[PDB]
Amino acid sequence: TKKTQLQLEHLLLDLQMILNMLNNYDNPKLTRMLTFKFYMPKKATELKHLQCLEEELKPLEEALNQAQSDPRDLISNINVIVLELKGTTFMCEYADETATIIEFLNRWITFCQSIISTLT
Ligand SMILES: [Mg+2]
């Protein structure tokens, strides 16, 4: 339904802001930002695969908390949107390799645009 398209766009904008918050703030800890490793979904083609994102929302916040600029507010709005799109409690599978926070955000930003392109 269109209600599903709206919520993904809301989710896309929040993910869009976090990615733009790192690609414009370069001086603060180019060191520390590239060291966090996030677990990637094996296959992200269905709407239920947001379980792989929900479980990493808390580690995403702890990485953003080390950058002073509000991270706690953005992660909460992301959490409520994810809980309204994937919701059975399915067993999400992860890839073997970990990725950077930049690659992690681009993966789910691409995921939302992929599902938003599917519904339209
Ligand atoms: Mg890698």
Distance 97 CA to ligand 1 centre (A): 6
Q: Please report, as a single letter, which amino acid is at residue 108.
A: W
**Ion ligand 1, residues whose Cβ is below 5 A away:** 97, 99
- What are the residue ranges spanned by the domains of the chain? 1-120
**C-alpha closest to that of 14 among 102, 111, 109:** 109
Tell me how far the alpha carbon of residue 28 lies from the centroid of ligand 1, in angstroms: 23
Q: 40 C-alpha to center of ligand 1: Å?
A: 10
Between CA 3 and CA 57 the distance in angstroms is 23
Contact of 106 with 19, CB cutoff 8 Å: yes
Closest CA to 81 of 6, 20, 1, 2: 6
Residue numbers followed by a gap, the chain, C–N over 2.5 Å: 69, 87
CA of 106 to the centre of ligand 1 (A): 13
